[PDB]
């Protein structure tokens with residue numbers, strides 16, 4: 667274990683708690699959304715983030731936070747504004763920003 671990776675684990679749990687519908691917990695289902703990859707270059711979701719974390723693919727906070735931001739921005743891009751998904755991504759961006767601000771202040775003074 668390392669202190670940084672433990673912090674990322676805690677931070678990832680805190681971000682997922684904000685996704686009360688669990689709609690970002692797993693990859694957007696390509697079987698239901700067959701054109702998703704037409705529009706979205708790099709899909710992201712909380713399970714893939716956890717897999718990245720446990721595989722040591724986040725050694726710095728920026729790479730981790732950019733993947734969180736990708737969950738949000740992919741959703742805003744794909745979905746019309748008047749959808750449950752778009753509205754949920756906006757709320758996740760707002761509620762997650764505070765989580766990431768406090769967590770980044772911990773990794774920097776590490």
Ligand SMILES: Cn1c(=O)c(=O)n(C)c2cc(N3CCCCC3)c(NS(=O)(=O)c3ccc4c(c3)CCCC4)cc21
Pocket residue numbers: 688689690694695698699740741744745750751
């Ligand atoms: C295309 N899409 C996104 O762009 C996106 O950001 N998310 C986060 C999505 C997330 C899901 N779920 C959400 C449930 C958990 C499994 C993954 C799906 N599955 S779904 O069968 O199309 C579906 C599912 C539920 C509802 C609708 C579509 C339409 C509105 C009514 C509710 C597509 C998503």
